[PDB]
Design a protein around this ligand. Sequence first.
Ligand SMILES: COc1cc2nc(N3CCc4c(ccn(CC(C)C)c4=O)C3)nc(NS(=O)(=O)CC(F)(F)F)c2cc1OCC1CC1
Ligand SMILES: COc1cc2nc(N3CCc4c(ccn(CC(C)C)c4=O)C3)nc(NS(=O)(=O)CC(F)(F)F)c2cc1OCC1CC1
Ligand SMILES: COc1cc2nc(N3CCc4c(ccn(CC(C)C)c4=O)C3)nc(NS(=O)(=O)CC(F)(F)F)c2cc1OCC1CC1
Lengths: 450, 450, 450
Amino acid sequence: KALSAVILAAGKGTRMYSDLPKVLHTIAGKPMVKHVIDTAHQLGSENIHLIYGHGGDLMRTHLANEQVNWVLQTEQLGTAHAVQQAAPFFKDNENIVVLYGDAPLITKETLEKLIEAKPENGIALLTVNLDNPTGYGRIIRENGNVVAIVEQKDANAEQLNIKEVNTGVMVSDGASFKKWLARVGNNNAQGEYYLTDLIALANQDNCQVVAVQATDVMEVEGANNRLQLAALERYFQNKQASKLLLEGVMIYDPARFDLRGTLEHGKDVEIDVNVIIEGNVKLGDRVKIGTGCVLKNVVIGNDVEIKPYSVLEDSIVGEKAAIGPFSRLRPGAELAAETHVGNFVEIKKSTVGKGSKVNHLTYVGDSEIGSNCNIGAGVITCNYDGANKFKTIIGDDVFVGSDTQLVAPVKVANGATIGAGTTITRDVGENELVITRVAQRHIQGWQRPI
Amino acid sequence: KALSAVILAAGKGTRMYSDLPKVLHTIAGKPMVKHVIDTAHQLGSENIHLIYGHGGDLMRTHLANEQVNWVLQTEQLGTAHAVQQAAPFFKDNENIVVLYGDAPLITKETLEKLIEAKPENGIALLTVNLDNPTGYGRIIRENGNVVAIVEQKDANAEQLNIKEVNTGVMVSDGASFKKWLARVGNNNAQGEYYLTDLIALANQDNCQVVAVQATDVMEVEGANNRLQLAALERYFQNKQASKLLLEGVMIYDPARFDLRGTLEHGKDVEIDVNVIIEGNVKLGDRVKIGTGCVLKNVVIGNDVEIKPYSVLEDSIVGEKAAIGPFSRLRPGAELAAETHVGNFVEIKKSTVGKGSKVNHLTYVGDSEIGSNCNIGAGVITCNYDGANKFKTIIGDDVFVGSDTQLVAPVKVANGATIGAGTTITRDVGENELVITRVAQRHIQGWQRPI
Amino acid sequence: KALSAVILAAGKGTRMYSDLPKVLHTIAGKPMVKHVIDTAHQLGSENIHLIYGHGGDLMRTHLANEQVNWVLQTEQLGTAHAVQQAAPFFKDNENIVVLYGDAPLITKETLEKLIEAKPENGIALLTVNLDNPTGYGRIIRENGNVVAIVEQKDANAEQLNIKEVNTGVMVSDGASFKKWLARVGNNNAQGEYYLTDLIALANQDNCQVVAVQATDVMEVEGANNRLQLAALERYFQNKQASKLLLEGVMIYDPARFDLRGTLEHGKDVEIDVNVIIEGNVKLGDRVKIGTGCVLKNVVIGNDVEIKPYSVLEDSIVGEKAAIGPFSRLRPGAELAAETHVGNFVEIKKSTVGKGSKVNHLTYVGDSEIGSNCNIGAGVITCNYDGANKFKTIIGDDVFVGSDTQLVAPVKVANGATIGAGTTITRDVGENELVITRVAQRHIQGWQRPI
Ligand SMILES: COc1cc2nc(N3CCc4c(ccn(CC(C)C)c4=O)C3)nc(NS(=O)(=O)CC(F)(F)F)c2cc1OCC1CC1
Ligand SMILES: COc1cc2nc(N3CCc4c(ccn(CC(C)C)c4=O)C3)nc(NS(=O)(=O)CC(F)(F)F)c2cc1OCC1CC1
Ligand SMILES: COc1cc2nc(N3CCc4c(ccn(CC(C)C)c4=O)C3)nc(NS(=O)(=O)CC(F)(F)F)c2cc1OCC1CC1
């Protein structure tokens, strides 16, 4: 059969103590609900029906590009009534999986096992065994077969002893859902339609209710507060780190590694402790990343070593280049092959050509630097106090002496030499040597405090 | 009844291999004994009797402000004799809890349970179950009731099998203590009065000895060496991190978070991995703290983002300000709302006014900077080689060009413009433009090494 | 008896996905096989027979100084045939222990227990119990005594139930090895001589085969991929951290500590979270190391505090000196007693004399600085665009003003004073005051954009 999904994402998440709605809280840099959407799609869902409510505007701005059918929940009438709002879109002959935007770790493999165990015209539900089943809905079995679910507040002494609980995740065919949902009543103190009633309605229709137990508890675990979110984050990071390790990436300590995005890697990549990878990061062969580096949306060529406490964003680094320690690459930094970037160096929106070195205490912004240049310590690109930010153009084989200020817009042609302590405001021609003429007083026999 | 406490804090701590005495070793930045004092006070103790001895001078300097009664132990005659020194201060009608300055994690709740289980004229003692009870005093029970305690060196084959051990923590009324303590003899090889004898003396007086078992082993655990101290530190940090998480603080990884002081927080506060919080730190709503930051005695307004590897001490930061990465705030740094502090910037004892930006490679000390100023890269506040450190005063809307040295004492008035590479020694007036006139040699056809 | 060892180190390590051979992958900064060699030597081995093959050239370059007998494996004919290549070197009357260069954690103590349990003319083998023995060779016991080993692919339903497995580690006398090895046939599908056959051959010779069970599973664990390597690294680091803690080093969190080399320490040494120690590091008494520091091949005198995010390599630091935060010591940095090195300061191949201070935004290379000097913020040592790197010599009691460039080769004698913003190219004499004479335009009524 075909498949479509329903994700409940309307909940408030009061225990989060947040102006953000529950499902928008992130795991590895992306909202909980987004993980669930991706799994639903990877599962093969034709449609994804996102049921939303609380913090609606924030949902729509934060998930604008998500390939989903937006189903707004006006009146809060319980989960069965919410899914019923998505029900008119169900095709009779397709399976419908119900998921929760606050249980982000649910896997493709487990859901595939659940679908395949669904009997024709029946229900398949996910259940899980807990040492302490307190608070959750108990799974009721008559002679092996599943007949009902009983919540804590209704459970008798013996029922309270059942260690198998309801995860809320279930699969059934479209027509069955439409059929059973309509027959759910709200004769209760809270006056709302509970999704769990569908188990009894299937049994009363003499349809099979197969439970599939999940081996991994965390997979069906929901984050109701930030302690629980942190537990989920750590599990998810460990899962990501294990994969990379078995693929051949050396992570010196997976427990001190963070991937918040996607990583593309070559072979013999080494990643030291306390490194954070964000956005889209591509690493070529034999790249070495030292402790405390942060890489966000970067492309690193082969044989690049990144020394400790370097921070890179939206940057490109050519093969055999050397970065760090304490280097800052800001958006738009392009380093060609064999370039050197050293301590306390900031590079913004600039191209640095092959073999050029920028080794200490320097700021380069809005600049184009050619090949084999020597950019001295204390060199700074700046602007006049004016309207917009102009560019600095440096050619090949240029020597820029220590503590020189390059005032944009300015051009320094091939082979030029610029002496230490210079203020460059006029264009420098090819093979031109610029020296600052200093004026100094020398005072003899000046004695310092003894 | 009323309550007072006795804390044994005289021990040497040889296995620490330290010139510091055992109890002065820190958990979360404060001495072990200080945790115990605070718990004793929170418990409701009228008096706290600190028994001290080894490293006495260090105790008195390190705990000067502690609201305690200082009881010096001259002769080392065992624990019963030490408590006896505090005994003349016990009121007959008050409970007395005995605690240990090297078991820092003991909680208020557990101690409340112990006190309430104390029978009139009886004793209540804390005990705990261990898989491996080796080395510790075994709890001896006759037909359910506690009669004696037997140490390893006296325990027979069967007694050595008892898994319940003595934590040393006990409660009894004042008069009872005075009474039983006096009756403790020292007829032993080590020739000292053991506190444990009080169990037998109570039983021989036909008084009840109720044991209260502690559920959490770490709570009654003492640190005898630094391995054990580290285990205690990690437990204590995890307890602190859990609280903050349930209160709504997002700590991306509680296992890589350190709080060594007190934290005050608003809502939607996000704290990335490897952050250390020391002293008194106040965080407003929606503050973002990136990886590797250290905050010590700071106040952070709403909506401030602190980028990675920033270190702040005794500083104030206004709302919507931007700090980091690689920023240094030293004591006396005050940043007004909407200010910008960037990489490799050091700020010491300075006020920076609203909307001002200090973005790269800069040192500002002893300075007052107004609103909407632009402080260029490489700008440095300095002094003449003289006696004391003078101040630099900058008004509103001032432009200070790159790599400019401001030589204090100097004043730069509202709207002044200072060109790159300048040395400012004379006061700069309002709307005054200061440009350095450069002298340069230009040499054509200078060829660099090929 | 005497002892010699055989280490199998020829394996490919395909699952590592590396151009490095398996055994050259590092634990704590040194190749797996090197740990095994050191243990073999500490055990008391007269000879160490290194069997090698895959990535042979890399082995020989990476292990050049290892005191071993290099035994090249040309034809890959199974492990029994490999050890047979080392067999002509075995002395009849010595014990021979067989080890694996990919099981790096094997200890001296466990191997001593194995040797001593070896019966005369018999075999002693290491075995270990596993919950899940899947994939490994099962230990077969007849009435308590060890008779054979059966691999997964030959194991029947019941044999597959045996939870005791073969670690491959074994001891026997030289003559016995030579004797049993020769009698190993290769009548199998893979056509290779298996070392395990020696158990059956000993039993058929009516010789005792004693198994010694290992209590610690990780000790006999081999790293076949990088996930497993990381598990081994973490175990090994925790073992190293525990030792240091019990010796009196305060490591605030052993789970965030990394030692990749050797550490020599005094008393009351404090090491904050996320510190990496590499090469040979010596720490005197009461040294404080803050978070995120990296120390590689350094000597730190007594009472030195190293503030956070400092990186030191091949450097020497005198007693009571102050380093950091954000300080860089590059090879050849020597700091005398009571010196100060502050934020965003880089020091390369330079000596800094007693009480001198280098506190902000400074680069010192190839320099000699005397005692009690004041090196201002923004000070830079540089060179002319020439052939080699020349030296800067500064005497005692020199004041070097902010943002001064020192152009080597140059000498600044005792008691000289150098004003801010200076370019020093000529030698500065004793008690000479050098001030830069500035030329400035002042323009009144210059109004900035409103
Ligand atoms: C963010 O939005 C959500 C998320 C959500 N998530 C979950 N779950 C996700 C979390 C969860 C669940 C079951 C069990 N555990 C315990 C675990 C298996 C040990 C869980 O953690 C189910 N249930 C929900 N409702 S439910 O509990 O009634 C579902 C039921 F489990 F079937 F009962 C639910 C409702 C919801 O609001 C939409 C409502 C308004 C229409
Ligand atoms: C720093 O000063 C201390 C701290 C201290 N602490 C402790 N404890 C604190 C530590 C402790 C304890 C019991 C059991 N465990 C094991 C645990 C429960 C698994 C412990 O770790 C008791 N006992 C002490 N003495 S004691 O062992 O005799 C107390 C007794 F447990 F009752 F016996 C004790 C003495 C002491 O010196 C003062 C003496 C000179 C007057
Ligand atoms: C890097 O080089 C190596 C390392 C190596 N290591 C190991 N081991 C080391 C790894 C290992 C081992 C046994 C069991 N476990 C599981 C554990 C005890 C739970 C292991 O992890 C043995 N065995 C090896 N061979 S073996 O498995 O046949 C040895 C046997 F275990 F006796 F069978 C082996 C061969 C090898 O190549 C040389 C061959 C060409 C001559």
